[PDB]
Amino acid sequence: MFVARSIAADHKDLIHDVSFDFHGRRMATCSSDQSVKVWDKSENVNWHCTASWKTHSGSVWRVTWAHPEFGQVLASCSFDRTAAVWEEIVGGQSHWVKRTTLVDRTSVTDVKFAPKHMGLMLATCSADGVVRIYEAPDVMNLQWSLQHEISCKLSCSCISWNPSSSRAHSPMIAVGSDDSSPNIMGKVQIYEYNENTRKYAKAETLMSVSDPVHDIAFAPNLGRSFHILAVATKDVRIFTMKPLRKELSSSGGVTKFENHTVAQFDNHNSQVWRVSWNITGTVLASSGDDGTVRLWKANYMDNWKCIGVLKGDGNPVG
Amino acid sequence: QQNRHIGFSWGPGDLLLYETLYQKQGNSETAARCPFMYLVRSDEDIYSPVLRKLFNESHSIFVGLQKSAEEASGKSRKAQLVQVSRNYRSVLRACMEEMHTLSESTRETAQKYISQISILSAMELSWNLCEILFIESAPAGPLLILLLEWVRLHVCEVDNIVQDVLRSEKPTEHEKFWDGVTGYVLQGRMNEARQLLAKEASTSASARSMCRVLDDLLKKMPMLHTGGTQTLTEFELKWQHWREECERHLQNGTFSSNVHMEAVCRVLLGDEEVLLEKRDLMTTWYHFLVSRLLFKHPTVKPTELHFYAQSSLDMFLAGDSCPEPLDNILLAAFEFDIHQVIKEFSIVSSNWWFVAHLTDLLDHCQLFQAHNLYFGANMREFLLLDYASGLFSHHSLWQLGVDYFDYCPNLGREYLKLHMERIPLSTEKKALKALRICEQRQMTEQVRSICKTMAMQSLCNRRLGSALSWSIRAKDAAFATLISDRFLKEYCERGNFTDLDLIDNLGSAMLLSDRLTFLGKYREFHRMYSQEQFSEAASLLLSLMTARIAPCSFWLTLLLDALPLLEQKSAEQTYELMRCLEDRMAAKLESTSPDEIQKQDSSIDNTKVEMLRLALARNLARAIVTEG
Amino acid sequence: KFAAKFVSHKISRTRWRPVSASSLQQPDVFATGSWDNEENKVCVWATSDFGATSLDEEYQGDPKQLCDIKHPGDVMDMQFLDKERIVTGSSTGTVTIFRHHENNQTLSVNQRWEQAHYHVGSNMRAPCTAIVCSSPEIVSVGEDGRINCFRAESRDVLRTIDDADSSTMHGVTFLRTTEILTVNSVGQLKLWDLRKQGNDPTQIFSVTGERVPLHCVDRHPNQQHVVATGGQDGMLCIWDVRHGKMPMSLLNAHEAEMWEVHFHPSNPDHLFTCSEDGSLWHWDASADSLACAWLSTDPTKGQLEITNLLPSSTLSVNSLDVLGQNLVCGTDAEAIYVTRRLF
Amino acid sequence: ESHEAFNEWFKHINSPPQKPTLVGQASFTEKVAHEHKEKKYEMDFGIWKGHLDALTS
Amino acid sequence: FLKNEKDNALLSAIEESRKRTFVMAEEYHRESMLVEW
Amino acid sequence: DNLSIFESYGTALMEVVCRDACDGHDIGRMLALALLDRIVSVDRQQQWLLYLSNSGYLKVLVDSLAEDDVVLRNLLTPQPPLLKALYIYESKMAFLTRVAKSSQGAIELLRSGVIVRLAQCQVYDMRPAPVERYRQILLPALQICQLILTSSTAQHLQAAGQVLQ
């Protein structure tokens, strides 16, 4: 019996995105009006606009929060070919201050902070088919150093860090490929950090994702011996990735992978545009051209099913 | 709306939903405003105050059970489990009663309150059916006594009818009088039926002779007793002989002048047509089942119950009425299909409470196949993990979910770590509670996260003492150095330390970082200076400068202090100080920028150095004289 | 001995309504504050049905809620100022006086100080961690290290001691009419004279070598120099504030954080303590019977009798209050426990 | 009583506080920990000596 | 002959059960004879 | 003197040994029942017998006899899965036979409904080595009954009524 309560946003232009902070006490919204707004949740469960500023002169494609250990930090990326880092400089005098602009050749299609145990790192991807990884050398001085350039050889549309804090797994990034490519398949690529070469190397290519990829999400690993990846294309796909075996005598490779499609769902009825896991990785949300958000969950027999569908008027489908 | 794409964002237990736009650019005629806030929440009835009370009381019950699961064997243990089951059902009762008073006093929530009373009725109904069966598992004989008690505890309409009849000035002339007599017979309540018949025996002489025969038949009716030495075969023979006595009285036309006494005698024979004519007194097919068992099959075996249950449902529902979801649950229980009982209740119930606690209790009865599901955990751990995860969504109940996760080490420790790091720490009291919970369960990284978060919150609030205390608890040497440097900004500026008493009491915590070490040792030097231990203060300063624990600007500061110290009215010690001065100067020539190199104190430093050289020379001569 | 009432909110604070010293009436009304919910409240409760004149019926009476009011933030601390007025400290840094209207069974906001506690420079609200009342005077302490003095009829703060502590203060009590004691996150008990024009404490007491947070402080009712404190280590410390800077006694009381300590107001040979470990202990110093029994340094003179009053396996007991034969306490188990026959 | 007092005294005289020893390559944190151990030893020795003189009397 | 000793242990256990049966059966026969007398 | 030592421990040693004799496992149960059989025989005071009755262990041992109907049905087979069950049954029947030799024991057994429970057992109606085995079942059951009642007191005449049943 989910209940939705409308608020009068009164946005100058429609906001193309909303992002919660890590604690779900704050949200950021962004719009065609060239602004970002920040909203704080009162004790009475009401939202109040606490900051509003003009951010750019280009289509803000993505917004992301840093981990709260680095303070109140936002990153945004744009059609203007830049990513920007913002810090909430409060006195009640909040005024999200631009700390840097990353300027290294085409639209920056996605931006994601790395898992906190890797430090204050930011990945960007661009339609030039490059992923760039920056590091802030001082968390108190939000200067950024370009650490890595990863040539994907396909237009990058989206990126996901593997959130696994296990020291048994090298840092991993999934990347997509929007290119319609009548033929080229492999539109999801996986990169692994190689300690011996101090470089990201291509570990995997999901050859079954011959369709254009719109979004990708690694599931929270929560002690599994295998990774789970959701992929948004013309359908919703779920992959399990099992790392292969090993010998302590010597090792310098990407440790090849066994990949299985465990689910494929065409029930979207339109090019599924977004996929998002809940905080436990037990429920998937998807959105598509059918004007619905769908909720997916496995039962105790690992059988995934839909568990909810919505309407244009805002009512949940009976 | 106007073919708009849905954006979503997962919160810690909430789903944020919004209209993104169109991925089309400014387009689409259909015009309006996207002022819609959509928080989709999983779960709903948990918010009830009474249900929360139930949950607290039963967490107490669960903890008790777990702790006592090591102490008792066979029969004693079985009885203890039965009593735990009864306690759960009593909590259900209290909750229903409270909800009912609430509905009575409040008209607007009474619709919903009655819906929830019916929900709890569902819960107690299923819990108790399952209990009785698996946990008691009574053999042929006691089974029917318990089923008569079961119908009596859940079907109260006959007692209301009889109370209304008894409130009338003339109970025997009341329209429902014979319905009260027949209802007591249908429930096996022969003594209460006889008390009503004794009133009718007063009305007429012809009624009195028939009432005496019927009273004697009801009095002689064989009943099973929980403790008799009587065998089921000796009971069956007495029951057959009593039934032949009833049949003989009917065949002799003994009751032909009173249709109601004849109908009661036909009920005593188990006449199915007359039992079905009295459906409105039984109200349910399962009351009809138990009345059929009483008058046709009093020695029924557990293994035969399903056949009679199905036959009773089919006969009772023999019109346009479809079985209710409760009927499927009760039939599955009479079939002894525990998995089907759990499945049907999982479909009908909004809440996992019934299926979680009934399955937990039935697992303690050693019934389910004893193996893990599909992830190194069993039906019990899976359902407890999902229920506990549900409690973590709620701002006050997440603390209860912690203890449920402790139940299974494999299936609740990693979830507990993940959730403990996500708790909104708004107050020091809440953080201290979370820390106590983690420390008991050995979770270091989670506690480090807690402490660092608290200390950064303190850096934002400008509470330097609280921030330092939290950084020390974090062992956080990096954050320790950060706060030491903030105090250094403050002292480079004011000429005095804030919070003197804390720095003076650092003790062994001073060793957490070299920067903190320097800070504390320098504060000790100032303390020596206030105590006129001038030599001691100066030597401490010199040692700090030579160890280079001091940051390369405190070199100037400490060097000027050495300046007046030297200025006052062994040779090796004098040479040492000279070496320290020269090292400082070489460092300056290299590290210090040309801009900072050009400052005022140079000439003052040179005069201090000349005074030191003169004192050392004379001091060395004095030392040589002492050696002589 | 205890009636338990489940209330669908965690209870941070419980206090008895003060009885007039001339009244033969037993305490019957108490207040509660809630915490760790989206909507917190102050509630008033009665233990007796207004009308039972039988001296001979076993008290099986569940406490009945008389009235409530929404409280912004988490009720961090709560005290009665008098019979009609309840003071609260909020996690929002607000100090509020509520008035209880007994005739109508309602609470109303009488007065508030919305900027009682805040960090200097950011103007960010800081939690008000403890309060103490001596009608008409109110003192509050907070995470901002401030000591505020109010008078119930004054809209303005009468006195602030800015930067009184560089650490969070957790507890405050009156030593005398113009003197208070505070406890903090670095294990210090600090004595203050509220007439002294400076911001320095008059005296500082601490356990030597250890910086264990102190959460609670209470003063012996008849002996103005005897003080009890509780810490994060579950230790009960007894102090003579005239003798040295160290406690006179260190007693192993709890397995986790000690939230409250109270001397019995009329029989101070009894003391009560509650903890995060879920326990509620009664301490009796009368068992050997003017040397305060609590200040006995002779382990052979004054056997303290110690009794756990609650069942094993309660969640955190966040607050207790004791008046005459009556004790109330509040827990994280969404429960209020009440006894009317302590002894 | 004289034999009991002597045995209490004899137990106490044979349990003197241990003087802290500095290991010859101690870190800065270990030197601060040693000064804290030495101050603790002087205090513990003062208490032990006061108790010894009372038991001796 | 360690295995023989193990077998002997099993044999001794069987002998103990047999002695128990010998005693109780003899007692029952004696009781029946006493009742007849 | 041995009995004084058994008592001296208290109802604690008696409870642990009697509980374990009931529902331990195979060998241990058999040996524990044998031990109980032997201790109750030298029980002139009959304290052990009183403890067994008051603590409910005697009732549990009697109720557990209904367990063997399925065992007997499986056993009437040409090949027997395990003779262990037969030995437990023997030790158990031996112990019960020993308890029945006592004038009081016979009364306590009658109060506990031993004849009623034997009358409910269908194994006695399955007359077929298998024939020898039916024979032996009959032996123990009827044993206990007859011996008991006979050596039973004159006041407990119903004994005759229950046996006739």
Numbering used by the authors:
A (entry chain D): 1 to 91, 99 to 111, 113 to 150, 152 to 327
B (entry chain B): 18 to 586, 591 to 649
C (entry chain C): 4 to 292, 321 to 374
D (entry chain M): 746 to 802
E (entry chain O): 101 to 137
F (entry chain A): 1464 to 1591, 1610 to 1646
Sentences from the paper on this structure:
Nuclear pore complex (NPC) constitutes the only regular route of cargo transport between the cytoplasm and the nucleus.
Through close interactions with Nup160 and Nup37, ELYS becomes an integral component of the long arm of the Y complex in the NR subunit. Similar to that in the CR subunit, Nup205 in the NR subunit interacts with the short arm and the vertex of outer Y complex; it also associates with both arms of inner Y complex. Nup93 connects the stems of inner and outer Y complexes within the same NR subunit, and places its N-terminal extended helix into the axial groove of Nup205 from the neighboring subunit.
